[PDB]
Design a protein around this ligand. Structure first.
Ligand SMILES: CC(C)=CCC/C(C)=C/CC/C(C)=C/CSP(=O)(O)OP(=O)(O)O
Ligand SMILES: CC(C)=CCC/C(C)=C/CC/C(C)=C/CSP(=O)(O)OP(=O)(O)O
Ligand SMILES: CC(C)=CCC/C(C)=C/CC/C(C)=C/CSP(=O)(O)OP(=O)(O)O
Ligand SMILES: CC(C)=CCC/C(C)=C/CC/C(C)=C/CSP(=O)(O)OP(=O)(O)O
Ligand SMILES: [Mg+2]
Ligand SMILES: [Mg+2]
Ligand SMILES: [Mg+2]
Ligand SMILES: [Mg+2]
Ligand SMILES: [Mg+2]
Ligand SMILES: [Mg+2]
Ligand SMILES: [Mg+2]
Ligand SMILES: [Mg+2]
Ligand SMILES: [Mg+2]
Ligand SMILES: [Mg+2]
Ligand SMILES: [Mg+2]
Ligand SMILES: [Mg+2]
Lengths: 304, 304, 305, 305
């Protein structure tokens, strides 16, 4: 597997090792892992490492919140693969009022009190920015168990749906939270098209590198929760080629989205619409894209 | 054309007579109408009346801003029908920096100074709420000359496009501006699905009532600006029936979206999630749907 | 679900009881039902009753052939849901040379010899007309396992696909067979538009009533054979409404195809191209539409999943 | 637009200069061109040259038939752009009985007598093989004015339609005619998957190079005949990228179909299924793909709109 060249350069948060020990340690203490092999696999994935590659300009005293939130969403993402759509939906819906702080957790259930304590701690740190991450998380949670996953999709309809299932909007809100980067609604409206393009890049890069994992899951886990729903197989079907061939084509499409990103940002700036906040934001998106790809290329999660 | 029953009751702003006189009078003074027949056709349309049906709970001192904005948008909407997509786009793009206040108007050109003065006066009245209307308007302007109008579309793809072409988002921000109704990003995220449903209703009710007008325009106006792009045609073509039959089917679909609106709002309230600002906002959407329909049923713009 | 008003009036073939008892009796003797519950459910479907609603002016000595063919196709229709498209296709292709009479059945396999004996008997009664049903049937059969069921479709593309999957053309050739109604190659060209419209009505009325059944199936059968492919779901997702809402909208669309049927018919008559042969056929198409709907409204196949 | 690497070597028929002169000469005498500009454009397109790249192993005394047939189909393809679907359908349907030899041409109407005389001369040369090109040509002609061109299509649905509109099957029959290559029904059935794959390549390579021409047509010609129906626009819309970006992505997918052609061919041979006639046939398909691309990269038809 050979990626075509990219002009995007990744960056990693300076505190990645100390924060990853802190956050890995918290989940190894509290989360219900089934056995030692699963604990080792959890550490091998490097979930705080992908968080620190996503948000390398996070404030030093906020990056750990983002590591915790992405880590617990990954752990849940993997649990849902053993559930039906209905079970998975019941599982996520329990957590939504708890995330809001509206329902207290059952403290004998780690996922509930981990979720409750985390969002309470983020609101204590910055209430307004924390509150802006909630509905984007819920939108993602609901997409994860959407029966649209078991229905035929074309490439266009898939990318529209995958924007939610890849958590693009929660990642943008979490990036802003992590950086203390406040943007007005008018500013956010200005970069809507840049966001949508970025979402496709994140989606398809993840699909390419995680395909062998997902293929294996689809054959071994729950026929609904584990269902293969990915651009790799949607393009392979549409073009009647192999998955390997579809990945080569999708990679080339990913570099076209990187070019489009650069063009859209250049236009924003030329029209005099790139504020200091927006400049930081679109550079932030570029780190998400290159950081996700660097982690995807190297994590044991996808290679074993 | 027999409208299926509806539980939505329309409401009109109490100041409709006074404001209509004022705003109609302003455009009759400044807008370059080509002849007397057009001046009469302008008055006959009742553009301030549809605004007052749209925002019946607007603050007494803000409703005229809304009448002016929708009036000038309607006037431009009609001029664009006689231009190419390329000519329309150049026309609209010139007005966008002027709307932002970044570029002074040529005061010998009425659309330029009307646009400049209007936005300057809105920002003087409420800077932050006025600024939230700008990108929604520009989104709508750019939809009007999108070459996607000249290409095949199914009902789903069309509704997604029409959401921009009908100005759903600018109407929402304009409603909020006009009521002084401030909503947080989190509140707005909670009603995203309610907004999307409402958009379909506005789009298709307009398509139904404005069909004879748009058909006539497609036969006599510019080949691009006049191109017929509407749910009436799309459904007739997909189902292989007449435009008349398609309207009767679309009308039933509109009442289904009304029921869905009620369901979605009831769920929002049943969860603990309908804030007082949200309650005002979703009520406001219901006025928009019923008000648009009432105007569309009665305006001379559509019957002659 | 309250149907909207209709001007079409259904008719049932006079001999419905006799032929039902006869043909149900034949399949209860010969078909490989898995258990007693399945035998009771088969009887509850009333497959001979829908045949008698579809072709109420069939000749008295021909109607049983049509009940047999539609019964065995319904039965295979249900089996294919538990197969891959490849398995399903292999199953059907096996029956095609057998239906032609070119290949002997394995008499230890009831579907093969039931199909074999059926077609033999039909050609024995009217070789010319029986032969006209064959390619229509194979068309329909190949549609059933068409991988295009596993591809995204809008409503227009769906209706063109459904024409084959709902068996419009085999119902036409069967209707004609069962009535002794012969039509010239010229007469059949004139009604190609009336046919396409009628296919939409059969397709969608079935979609509406069979939705709950097909939904259950899409959750419990084979990921390919059982895949949900229906106008109710296509409209629900295109318009963002519930399945129940899409059913109410589609039903109104059905009534418009009815009005359009009447229009295309008068139009054929006003031009005077309405032959006596063509006139019986389009009245027969109207019986198919209204009969299909009456059966669908009442059959336990659709109300008890 | 730099084409990505290919392992295919295009070949050109050795009589290309002599046959181009003969066949261009014939159409310049008989066809009604609207002006001198159109006559020069015709010669610049080099329609005998694409024929000779498509079929470089054609028999020396048959290559001119293929050149004539593809030339007149290109000319008609362009005329249809100024017509409605209904007008173009009537136009094509008039030619079908004449192609068959069943109806005499109006000798004052060049398209009619050029088509009549050409198909008569092909049947005079090799009746059985000429006749096998007819239904593939008609299939293509009816695809050209098919309403589905005005309905939304995703990539998979489009490629399925474009197999007919690109004339894949007529090109295969014409290749076999021109090489005197006779295949059994069994041999033909064996290569269906190879055929389907090759069709996507022809289709998309053509879409890539002809996009600027077709875009201009869609802005200036008939709203139906001139309608933009192409993978370039479909992918640009689905992926949200520019047309140029879509072309670069689609070109990489064309090389994947080249690789897949090679794999299918290997497998045919690895099983026991590759005959001498099949080997010549699938090698001929490779020349079609590389030849069509080489012509498309260099013809003024696509670079000067
Ligand atoms: C895209 C990426 C590397 C990281 C996104 C970072 C995270 C955790 C975002 C939260 C939303 C989730 C869990 C997306 C996983 S997409 P998926 O289910 O396809 O991920 P998988 O392939 O299972 O690793
Ligand atoms: C939907 C409705 C009645 C009013 C919307 C109210 C306004 C002014 C919205 C601003 C954007 C415009 C002019 C949309 C017209 S949709 P169109 O071009 O289809 O309207 P037309 O049919 O030309 O009246
Ligand atoms: C259309 C109709 C009610 C009757 C036609 C009568 C028959 C048997 C025609 C033969 C072709 C078949 C099996 C159509 C059923 S469509 P399907 O698979 O959707 O039917 P289902 O919903 O499974 O009953
Ligand atoms: C594909 C290729 C180079 C040649 C095919 C050779 C020929 C003439 C085949 C006959 C069928 C036709 C006319 C296809 C043109 S595809 P089109 O209408 O897209 O061709 P255009 O882009 O107008 O040149
Ligand atoms: Mg996952
Ligand atoms: Mg996931
Ligand atoms: Mg993945
Ligand atoms: Mg308009
Ligand atoms: Mg408009
Ligand atoms: Mg309108
Ligand atoms: Mg069925
Ligand atoms: Mg079926
Ligand atoms: Mg059904
Ligand atoms: Mg063509
Ligand atoms: Mg062409
Ligand atoms: Mg082309």
């Amino acid at each position: 597997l050979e990626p075509p060249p990219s002009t995007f350069q990744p960056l990693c948060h300076p505190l990645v090792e100390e924060v990853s020990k802190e956050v890995d340690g918290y989940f190894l203490q509290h989360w219900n892992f089934p056995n030692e092999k699963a604990r080792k696999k959890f550490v091998a994935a490097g979930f705080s490492r992908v968080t620190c590659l996503y948000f390398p300009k996070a404030l030093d005293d906020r990056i750990h919140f983002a590591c915790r939130l992405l880590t617990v969403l990954f752990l849940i993402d993997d649990l849902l693969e053993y559930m039906s759509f209905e079970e998975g939906s019941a599982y996520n819906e329990k957590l939504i009022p708890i995330s809001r702080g509206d329902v207290l957790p059952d403290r004998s259930i780690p996922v509930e009190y981990i979720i409750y304590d985390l969002w309470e701690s983020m609101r204590a740190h910055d209430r307004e920015m924390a509150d802006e991450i909630l509905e984007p998380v819920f939108l993602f949670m609901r997409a994860q168990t959407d029966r649209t996953r078991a229905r035929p999709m074309g490439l266009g309809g898939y990318l529209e749906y995958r924007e939610r299932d890849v958590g693009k909007e929660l990642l943008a809100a979490l990036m802003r939270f992590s950086m203390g980067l406040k943007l007005s609604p008018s500013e956010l409206q200005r970069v809507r098209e840049i966001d949508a393009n970025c979402s496709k890049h994140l989606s398809v890069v993840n699909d390419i590198y995680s395909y062998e994992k997902e293929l294996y899951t689809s054959k071994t886990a729950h026929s609904e929760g584990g269902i293969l729903c990915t651009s790799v197989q949607i393009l392979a079907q549409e073009a009647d080629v192999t998955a390997e061939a579809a990945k080569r084509v999708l990679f080339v499409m990913c570099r076209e989205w990187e070019l489009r990103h650069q063009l859209l940002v250049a236009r924003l700036s030329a029209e005099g619409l790139e504020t200091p906040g927006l400049a930081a934001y679109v550079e932030g998106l570029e780190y998400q894209m290159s950081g996700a790809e660097l982690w995807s290329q190297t994590t044991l999660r996808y290679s074993v």
